[PDB]
C-alpha cells in the first residue's frame, strides 16, 4: 500500500496435501483429515475410541525413515495438534502405526 504493506495477522495456509500409508486395517486408527498451518498440524482422527485420556502417540519425522520425534502435541477433541511442521508424521495407536506425509508443492 502506502510505502509498505501492512499485513494483518499471519498469512494462513492450511496445507492440505498429505498422504497416508499404513499397515493396519483399522479405520479408527487412520486419520480422516490432516492440515497444517505454519507449524500446527491438525490431525482429525477417530480419537473418540480412546477414553480415560488414553489418546494415541504421535511422532514427527524429518524423513520417512528418520527417527520418530516425540514433539509437542495437544489433543482437541478428535484432533491432534502437532506443534511444528515436518515433511513426515507418524501416528501410533498402541502398537499399530500410520504414516503421514506432507507433500510439497512442485
Amino acid at each position: 500500500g502506502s510505502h509498505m504493506n501492512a499485513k494483518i495477522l499471519k498469512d494462513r495456509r492450511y496445507y492440505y496435501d498429505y498422504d497416508y500409508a499404513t499397515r493396519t486395517k483399522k479405520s479408527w486408527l487412520i486419520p480422516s483429515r490432516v492440515y497444517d498451518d505454519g507449524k500446527f498440524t491438525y490431525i482429525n482422527m477417530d480419537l473418540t475410541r480412546f477414553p480415560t485420556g488414553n489418546f494415541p502417540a504421535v511422532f514427527a519425522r524429518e524423513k520417512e525413515h528418520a527417527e520418530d520425534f516425540l514433539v509437542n502435541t495437544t489433543v482437541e477433541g478428535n484432533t491432534l495438534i502437532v506443534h511444528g511442521t515436518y515433511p513426515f508424521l507418524v501416528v501410533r495407536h498402541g502398537d499399530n502405526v500410520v504414516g503421514l506425509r506432507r507433500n510439497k508443492q512442485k
Partner: peptide, 23 residues
C-alpha cells in the same frame, strides 16, 4: 525401536476434501 517399515502398503491421498476442499 521399529524393526520393520511403519508405513507403506498403500500410499493413498487423504487430502482435505472431506465434503468440500474446505467449505
Amino acid at each position: 525401536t521399529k524393526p520393520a517399515p511403519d508405513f507403506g502398503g498403500r500410499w493413498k491421498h487423504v487430502n482435505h476434501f472431506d465434503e468440500a476442499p474446505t467449505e
